[PDB]
Amino acid sequence: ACDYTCGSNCYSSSDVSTAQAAGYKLHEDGETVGSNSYPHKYNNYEGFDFSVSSPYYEWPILSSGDVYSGGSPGADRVVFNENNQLAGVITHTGASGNNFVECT
Ligand SMILES: Nc1nc2c(ncn2[C@@H]2O[C@H](COP(=O)(O)O[C@@H]3[C@H](O)[C@@H](CO)O[C@H]3n3cnc4c(=O)[nH]c(N)nc43)[C@@H](O)[C@H]2O)c(=O)[nH]1
Ligand SMILES: [Ca+2]
């Protein structure tokens, strides 16, 4: 079963932890990857239900199981805060335009 389902993409807790760790490291290093400069601030314009405090940062989570290293980020993201606490997993899949919805 999937710990997180983003559209048709299935991720387990371990997939998320590995992605998050990568993202947080670049964050603490003040480094970025990709044309869209990830990890980058996540504003929470959607108003989700995060039980962890802001600020938030988003980082791609890939269905191939690889850690994002640039190129297309796909539709799914891991959202973490300053304390490396997981806020949630979200996706553009099933959301209009560039909005996001939560992974279930
Ligand atoms: N496979 C796939 N990819 C998609 C889809 N929709 C968008 N994409 C891809 O994902 C990427 C777009 O997302 P980004 O995370 O890069 O961009 C952010 C957001 O989409 C953009 C415009 O607002 O600024 C940022 N951004 C920063 N903070 C926020 C926020 O709180 N809410 C939203 N929605 N965006 C925030 C593109 O590279 C595009 O190809 C989709 O349905 N399927
Ligand atoms: Ca996996």
Side-chain angles (χ1 to χ4, degrees):
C2 310
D3 288 314
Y4 301 93
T5 304
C6 296
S8 303
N9 290 338
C10 182
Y11 295 112
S12 55
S13 288
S14 65
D15 290 319
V16 170
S17 291
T18 302
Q20 180 186 343
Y24 191 70
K25 177 252 294 129
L26 284 180
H27 170 66
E28 297 192 297
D29 292 356
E31 281 157 346
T32 263
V33 294
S35 282
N36 233 247
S37 295
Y38 291 97
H40 61 67
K41 196 153 189 280
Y42 178 75
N43 292 304
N44 200 25
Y45 298 135
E46 290 72 11
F48 292 122
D49 21 310
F50 307 143
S51 77
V52 127
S53 62
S54 86
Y56 307 118
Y57 308 93
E58 53 171 300
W59 175 254
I61 182 178
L62 303 189
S63 58
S64 62
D66 301 341
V67 159
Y68 178 73
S69 62
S72 177
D76 316 326
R77 309 283 181 271
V78 149
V79 173
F80 57 89
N81 75 359
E82 267 302 335
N83 304 136
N84 199 200
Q85 290 165 297
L86 174 64
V89 183
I90 61 177
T91 183
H92 280 304
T93 295
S96 37
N98 297 155
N99 291 78
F100 281 107
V101 287
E102 275 190 273
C103 301
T104 56

